[PDB]
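Exercise: predict the structure of this protein bound to EED.
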Amino acid sequence: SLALSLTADQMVSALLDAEPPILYSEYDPTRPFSEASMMGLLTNLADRELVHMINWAKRVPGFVDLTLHDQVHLLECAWLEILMIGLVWRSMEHPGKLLFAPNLLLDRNQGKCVEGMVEIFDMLLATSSRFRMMNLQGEEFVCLKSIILLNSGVYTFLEEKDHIHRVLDKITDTLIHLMAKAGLTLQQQHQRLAQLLLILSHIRHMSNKGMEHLYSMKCKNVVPLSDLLLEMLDAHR
Amino acid sequence: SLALSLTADQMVSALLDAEPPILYSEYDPTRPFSEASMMGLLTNLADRELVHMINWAKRVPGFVDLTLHDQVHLLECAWLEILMIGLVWRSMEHPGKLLFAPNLLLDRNQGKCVEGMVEIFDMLLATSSRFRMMNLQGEEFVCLKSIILLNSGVYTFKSLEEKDHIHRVLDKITDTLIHLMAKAGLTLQQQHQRLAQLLLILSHIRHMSNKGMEHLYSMKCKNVVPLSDLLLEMLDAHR
Amino acid sequence: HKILHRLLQDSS
Amino acid sequence: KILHRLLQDS
Ligand SMILES: COC[C@H]1C[C@]2(C)[C@@H](O)CC[C@H]2[C@@H]2CCc3cc(O)ccc3[C@@H]12
Ligand SMILES: COC[C@H]1C[C@]2(C)[C@@H](O)CC[C@H]2[C@@H]2CCc3cc(O)ccc3[C@@H]12
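Solution:
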């Protein structure tokens, strides 16, 4: 039970150091976009990101303590949420654009290339604008991303459940500590904690819509998905 | 600026008094269920509940200050989330059962009466067990339900002062939840931990709504149940 | 002529 | 299956 022994500053350090790299897409500027090719780009990217996510998740305090079955379930539940919160974070300093990768920065008009996707781009963009409005900090971002991992699938599972909730509570202590050290007042600290966690409601929604969309694209043979993506997708159905 | 001036005790007071009534089902307990009849009972109940939900929403502090268009958007986004948290709350003291109405208390095996439904029942039952595990209180519930109303569609919103007002109202409700916890004697650390625990529930509520909406929609298409015009409209807003 | 619109204006 | 394998490899 070593996750439980960490201080708040050690929690932050572990999470910052666990951060996966920002990967490049296979975007080829020599050819124009199609629905099929944009969906190919985004899913090829996500598939590579997923590998780095599995390794990140193992570095999230407490996660390694869970059984393999428990780890599968949590990741199967939250993977698209985790991809999405990263995207919104990466896009913060690019108003009106989604930075999927440094070589793949798309506006809503480029989103229109794929049927049904622009509605999701709008949600992701609105959420990135919330992040910018709040002045969301990287240390706060890593806490939220970890809470998603541990929380989204947590009720859809008994002593490991208690253990998850202990870790989740430690991430809360960590968030508050970060806010106190940044000089937020006691009242500002609880008001911001709430604002930040309400984000996760929106991230969940966007994930659910995204999963339906991706499934739609699979079922109409728009793009071939890697076996890993096929399995991650099949978990939600 | 009426809603920004409420005290914590007055906020709880207003939310408690705005509560909708608990409606009964038009269900007779001598007749077995079929997929059609059960979907008929659940949606008939929900349709009646929606009318009372509108009166409740108009009594949520700050809500009447928003434009009709914005009010519509928030209710369209959050309506099934709101029905579900009500369901989960009134099932809290009935382990393994969902209390849709006082004369319609359904077990997980009764969810199997409708295709694809037991999976949703299981999610609802797990959330209810969480409520029970946290010892969730009535004053906290009305706070959380109000937050869902104001939050779920808040980023889908030039009048930017609408968003800002609504964010002030959300902050007041946070202050109100914290007030309740301080009043119950929780330490600061415990207040913060509990506030987070309660808010993470709303991610699970949002998930269940999105699944529930996919299911209701599947039921509509294959014509297992005829839905009211209101319901068809509330459903059409999500696709 | 959304029902919701009308319910909101007629709320009690 | 694949996720399960990847979680052991690292
Ligand atoms: C698994 O592919 C993820 C892709 C493709 C979608 C799921 C589309 O079907 C709808 C929404 C799309 C995702 C948005 C979030 C995201 C984030 C990444 O870091 C990489 C790809 C994606 C999109
Ligand atoms: C609008 O009908 C809501 C009904 C029927 C469902 C949407 C099913 O299709 C799947 C999920 C069902 C709802 C779960 C929550 C709920 C709550 C109520 O207070 C009344 C009805 C319902 C169900």
